[PDB]
Design a protein around this ligand. Structure first.
Ligand SMILES: NC(=O)c1ccc[n+]([C@@H]2O[C@H](COP(=O)([O-])OP(=O)(O)OC[C@H]3O[C@@H](n4cnc5c(N)ncnc54)[C@H](OP(=O)(O)O)[C@@H]3O)[C@@H](O)[C@H]2O)c1
Length: 319
C-alpha cells in the first residue's frame, strides 16, 4: 500500500511489478500476469519500449480500470526511452508512440533507459557489417530537456533515469536552466550488489533509488553467466526465510524496503506474483539487516562487455 513522495510532489508505490519477459514468451502472457499483479496488489508497473509488451501491459491496466478494480490514479505506470532515441527531436515521438501502444494518456514515469546512446532509427539494435552495435554521441542534457518538455505537456507525470552513475546524475543535476530534477534512478540492486554509496548520494539529492534484478536476474544465458551465484540459493537468505517462515525472495525485497529502496519484482507465475506482495506483512531485524548488508560482493549479473568501449558506459572497468 505504501508510497514514497517524489521530489516533484507525485507519489511512487514502493513495490513495483517487473514486466520484462524474453522474446520466446508469448505476448499474451504480459496481459495475463499484469492483471494478476494488479489483482495481487501491485500498483507500480514497470515496462519499456525495449520490452515489446507495452500494448499488453497497457491493456491489462485499462482492463483493471474498466472492470472497476482500480482507477487510473491508483496505478503508477513506468515506460523508458530506448537508446536509439536519445537525440532530442526523437524523445517526445518515442513517448507518444509508447502511449499509443499502451492506450494511455500519460505515463506516471518516463526514464532514460540507459546512458549508452545508439545509432538513431527504428532499429533497436543497430548493427554494422561485423555485427557490432553502432554507438552515437549525444549530450544527455539535451535528452533531459526533451524529457522535461514531455513532463510539461502532461505526457509523463514524473521523469527520471536508469543505469546512471554518480557522474551522469550530477551532470543532469548541474544542468543550466534545469526545471525538473530526476525523481529516481533505477539500477540493478540486490544483496550481492547493494549500491550503498549510490543510495546515500540519492537520499542526499531527494532522488529515489529503484532496484531491478532485486531477486537476482532471470539469468538469460544470452546475457548472464550461469556460473554466477544464484541469489535465491544464498545460504543466509534461505536461513532468514526459514527464520521468518517467508521465502528468500521475500527477504530480498524486504531488505530494500527497509533501506529506503523502491524495489521491483518480476514474476510470470501466479503464485509467486501473489507471494511477493506479502513483503509488507513482516519486518527484518537490524541484525538481519546487518547480516544481509554483509552479503555485498559488487556482483553485476548482466555482462555488457560489448558496451565497455562506450563513452557513457556507466560502470568504469578495473582497467
Ligand atoms: N532499467 C533496466 O535496464 C532494467 C534491467 C533489468 C530489469 N529491469 C526491470 O526490473 C524488472 C525485474 O528484474 P528481472 O527481470 O531481472 O527479475 P527479478 O525481479 O530479479 O526476478 C528474477 C526471477 O525471480 C523469479 N521470482 C519472482 N518471484 C519469486 C519468488 N517469490 N520466489 C522465487 N523466485 C521468484 C522470477 O521467475 P518467475 O517469473 O518464474 O516467477 C524471475 O524470473 C524487470 O522485469 C524490468 O521491469 C530494468
Amino acid at each position: 500500500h505504501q508510497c514514497v513522495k517524489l521530489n516533484d510532489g507525485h507519489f511512487m508505490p514502493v513495490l513495483g511489478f517487473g514486466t520484462y519477459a524474453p522474446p520466446e514468451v508469448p505476448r499474451s502472457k504480459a496481459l495475463e500476469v499484469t492483471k494478476l499483479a494488479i489483482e495481487a496488489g501491485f500498483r507500480h508497473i514497470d515496462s519499456a519500449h525495449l520490452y515489446n509488451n507495452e500494448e499488453q501491459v497497457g491493456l491489462a491496466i485499462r482492463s483493471k480500470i474498466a472492470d472497476g478494480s482500480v482507477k487510473r490514479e491508483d496505478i503508477f505506470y513506468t515506460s523508458k526511452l530506448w537508446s536509439t532515441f536519445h537525440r532530442p527531436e526523437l524523445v517526445r515521438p518515442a513517448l507518444e508512440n509508447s502511449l499509443k501502444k499502451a492506450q494511455l494518456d500519460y505515463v506516471d514515469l518516463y526514464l532514460i533507459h540507459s546512458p549508452m546512446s545508439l545509432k538513431p532509427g527504428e532499429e533497436l539494435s543497430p548493427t554494422d557489417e561485423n555485427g557490432k552495435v553502432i554507438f552515437d554521441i549525444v549530450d544527455l542534457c539535451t535528452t533531459w530537456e526533451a524529457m522535461e518538455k514531455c513532463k510539461d505537456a502532461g505526457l509523463a507525470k514524473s521523469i527520471g533515469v536508469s543505469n546512471f552513475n554518480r557522474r551522469q546524475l550530477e551532470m543532469i543535476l548541474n544542468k543550466p536552466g534545469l526545471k525538473y530534477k530526476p525523481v529516481c534512478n533505477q539500477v540493478e540492486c540486490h544483496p550481492y550488489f547493494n549500491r550503498s554509496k549510490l543510495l546515500d548520494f540519492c537520499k542526499s539529492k531527494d532522488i529515489v533509488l529503484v532496484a531491478y534484478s532485486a531477486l537476482g536476474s532471470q539469468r538469460d544465458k544470452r546475457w548472464v553467466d550461469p556460473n554466477s551465484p544464484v541469489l535465491l540459493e544464498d545460504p543466509v537468505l534461505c536461513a532468514l526465510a526459514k527464520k521468518h517462515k517467508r521465502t528468500p525472495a521475500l527477504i530480498a525485497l524486504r531488505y530494500q524496503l527497509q533501506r529506503g529502496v523502491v524495489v521491483l519484482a518480476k514474476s510470470y507465475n501466479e503464485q509467486r506474483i501473489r507471494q511477493n506482495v506479502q513483503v509488507f506483512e513482516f519486518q527484518l531485524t537490524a541484525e538481519d539487516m546487518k547480516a544481509i548488508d554483509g552479503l555485498d560482493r559488487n556482483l553485476h549479473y548482466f555482462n555488457s562487455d560489448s558496451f565497455a568501449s562506450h563513452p557513457n558506459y556507466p560502470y568504469s572497468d578495473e582497467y
